[PDB]
Design an enzyme around this catalytic site. Structure first.
Site, PDB file in Angstrom:
ATOM      1  N   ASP A 174     -10.903  -9.577   6.799  1.00 11.52           N
ATOM      2  CA  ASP A 174     -12.368  -8.617   6.743  1.00 11.52           C
ATOM      3  C   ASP A 174     -13.126 -10.920   6.325  1.00 11.52           C
ATOM      4  OD1 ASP A 174     -12.362  -6.609   6.596  1.00 11.52           O
ATOM      5  OD2 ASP A 174     -11.652  -5.886   4.167  1.00 11.52           O
ATOM      6  N   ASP A 215      -2.092 -18.543   0.970  1.00 10.35           N
ATOM      7  CA  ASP A 215      -3.003 -19.234   0.712  1.00 10.35           C
ATOM      8  C   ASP A 215      -4.007 -20.448   0.856  1.00 10.35           C
ATOM      9  OD1 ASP A 215      -1.067 -19.761  -0.289  1.00 10.35           O
ATOM     10  OD2 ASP A 215      -1.544 -21.274  -2.513  1.00 10.35           O
ATOM     11  N   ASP A 250      -5.363  -7.376   5.572  1.00  7.31           N
ATOM     12  CA  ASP A 250      -6.421  -6.555   5.341  1.00  7.31           C
ATOM     13  C   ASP A 250      -7.613  -7.977   4.494  1.00  7.31           C
ATOM     14  OD1 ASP A 250      -7.782  -4.966   4.259  1.00  7.31           O
ATOM     15  OD2 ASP A 250      -6.840  -3.663   2.520  1.00  7.31           O
ATOM     16  N   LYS A 274       4.002 -15.166   2.137  1.00  5.66           N
ATOM     17  CA  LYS A 274       3.669 -15.699   0.645  1.00  5.66           C
ATOM     18  C   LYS A 274       5.703 -16.238  -0.006  1.00  5.66           C
ATOM     19  CE  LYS A 274       1.970 -17.122  -2.651  1.00  5.66           C
ATOM     20  NZ  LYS A 274       1.625 -18.846  -2.390  1.00  5.66           N
ATOM     21  N   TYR A 308       0.855  -0.761   0.013  1.00  3.93           N
ATOM     22  CA  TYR A 308       0.209   0.058  -0.259  1.00  3.93           C
ATOM     23  C   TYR A 308       1.130   1.334  -0.089  1.00  3.93           C
ATOM     24  CZ  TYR A 308      -3.574  -2.866   0.742  1.00  3.93           C
ATOM     25  OH  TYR A 308      -4.722  -4.454   1.118  1.00  3.93           O
TER      26      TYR A 308
END
Ligand SMILES: [Cl-]
Ligand SMILES: [Cl-]
Lengths: 362, 362
Positions: A255, A227, A251, A195, A149
């Site tokens: 959620d 994942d 993020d 990752k 970000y």
């Protein structure tokens, strides 16, 4: 930091727009019980943000509000935004010019999002009862200052857009320590999500978390790919205590984990920064604003996070958590969690039940 | 492309290691029914990959195998890897030196992962039956050639690691068209998943998808943020038909959506490239390798994807899909989907049931 016994604390309360004021009112009634029982002074300085500030000042985050925020010990925020102010551009609307601007000004580095499935509301969860298993009780600790970000360079032209996902040691040290400390005082388990099999940012992440974990020998550290974490939140969420992860992965995962209790009205949020910011995880509810329907539990549990993380009043926070749970366990439901909607208690009724219970069990 | 009637097709079959050979055997028995019914010739050229190739050639992807792959029309791959070869370094193991190396050599640009919750196995899903609703039937179409896994510059030093997330027009055009074409022949709905509110790569993504969508006026396009898609896969998955998304978001979301049927043994995968690659979505199963336990449905439905997407034999593929469903609907279960394990049929029995049913309904 070390929390010494303090008897005077200052809170910037920014009630916001729409349901914000309704639920912040109840949170503050619970704060009145805490004040009575602990003998502590909570000096509340009220501030205008979002639609409320546009109306009064002409902009969603005025200089007056910023000053109140920077002079307080913690910031307690309701919800902002509403149809009155939509149709203003982007930069001038409540959610952008008010909320995102406040968050930016606070130089926040961590978002903390606890997720509990209460035994008595399992039927509200999207997951089968046997999937929930021995129970869901986890916390996401998300890095907020860097990663994709904010990494540079970044940009857009006519044929391409790009961002840079980057982590450095100092950034990862800071958030990892945050997560380890939370884990220390919970179930002494951290899962770090990255990752690292494909991304260099994640290889650095994992290397530095493993380094920090040496400073916390009694905390169990596991590492999982993002994942696979996304699948495990659905297949076996009870395995998680603290989930430590990056800006972007946190993020997405925080959620996802918010779907598990199956109502946003239950979920509190804290961000750690120059000053800490405490707010409900969910947003605007224009269709019920003013109707005494909104669930106040998120705002109430955000108060509990503030007490715990800004003021070190851990016992008090656990009592608030307990009183919410006991009221739910009793069968009381606002519309968002009621199977029979005409059997829903109001915002104000729910708030009174929690206050009376907190007084009972204290 | 236009699929003309062809009566001779060449398939590179790479059975692999462990359960690979067991399930590929059954898939090929179903291919024998298709061959009998359609009168078409499937010339199968068998190739060694992974552990099988290490044993025979000394490396997991030998020159002989590459040649077979490049000379075939489509590549049909079982599973690779096993405890025999673990303890070889990284570059020399089956999964890296064999599978990832094959994928790389094929210059793949799209991964297609269909997800169906069969009515009769809803009890195996992690989601409550009312959450599943009117049903789950979706497909993820993931970009594979670019984005953050390949963007440059990228690197790691002692204090920082970084990757570049990037998309350009030509890349997004290609994958968007893939998804729109799949949508055209399904329920004429695409949802595109990005993070366009924060990432420049995603702003470009969204701009170009919106452009492509003009070439497909009868397909409904929606756009959602990846964090909200992650929640909606759990709260209301029946809203999705085709999900079009980036390398990274597709990696996370297609794995999340794989939790929904609640067994990996059910799930096929296709990647589109120089030649197309058809394989089960899940991996190695060393603990059941050789025991005639593995569920062959993933390998069988990967054959159906091959028929449809490599050969344009859409009707034939839908018949295979139907025969699998009918056998499940009848009550037949391999161990991975059986509530009573001693009532499980074997790999070979399951494969025979599907073949006999396919002959029945053809
Ligand atoms: Cl990130
Ligand atoms: Cl990407």
């Amino acid at each position: 930091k070390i929390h010494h016994h303090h008897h005077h604390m200052k809170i910037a309360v920014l009630p916001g727009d729409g349901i914000g004021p309704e639920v912040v009112r109840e949170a503050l009634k619970v704060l009145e019980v805490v004040e009575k029982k602990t003998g502590k002074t909570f000096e509340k300085v009220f501030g205008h943000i979002g639609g409320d500030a546009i109306d009064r000042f002409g902009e969603p985050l005025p200089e007056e509000t910023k000053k109140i925020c920077l002079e307080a010990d913690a910031i307690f925020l309701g919800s902002v935004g509403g149809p009155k102010w939509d149709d203003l551009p982007p930069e001038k609307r409540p959610e952008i010019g008010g909320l995102l601007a406040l968050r930016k000004m606070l130089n926040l580095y961590a978002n903390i999002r606890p997720i509990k499935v209460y035994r008595s509301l399992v039927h509200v969860s999207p997951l089968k009862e046997k999937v929930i298993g021995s129970g869901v009780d986890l916390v996401t600790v998300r890095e907020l200052s860097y990663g994709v970000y904010y990494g540079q360079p970044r940009g857009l032209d006519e044929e391409k857009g790009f961002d840079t996902m980057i982590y450095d040691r100092k950034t990862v040290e800071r958030i990892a320590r945050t997560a380890f400390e939370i884990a220390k005082n919970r179930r002494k388990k951290v899962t770090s999500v990255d990752k690292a099999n494909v991304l260099y940012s994640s290889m650095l992440w994992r290397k530095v978390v493993n380094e920090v974990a040496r400073e916390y020998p009694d905390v169990e550290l596991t590492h999982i790919y993002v994942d696979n974490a996304a699948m495990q939140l659905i297949l076996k969420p009870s395995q998680f205590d603290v989930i430590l992860t990056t800006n972007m992965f946190g993020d997405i995962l925080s959620d996802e984990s918010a779907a598990l209790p199956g109502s946003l009205g239950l979920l509190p949020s804290a961000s750690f920064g120059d000053k800490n910011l405490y707010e409900p995880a969910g947003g605007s509810a224009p269709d019920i604003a003013g109707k005494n329907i909104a669930n106040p539990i998120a705002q109430i549990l955000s108060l509990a996070m503030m007490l715990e993380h800004s003021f070190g009043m851990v016992e008090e926070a656990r009592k608030i958590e307990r009183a919410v749970e006991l009221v739910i366990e009793e069968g009381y439901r606002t519309r968002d969690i009621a199977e029979d909607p005409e059997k829903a208690v109001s915002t104000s009724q729910m708030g009174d039940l929690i206050c009376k219970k907190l007084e009972e069990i204290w």
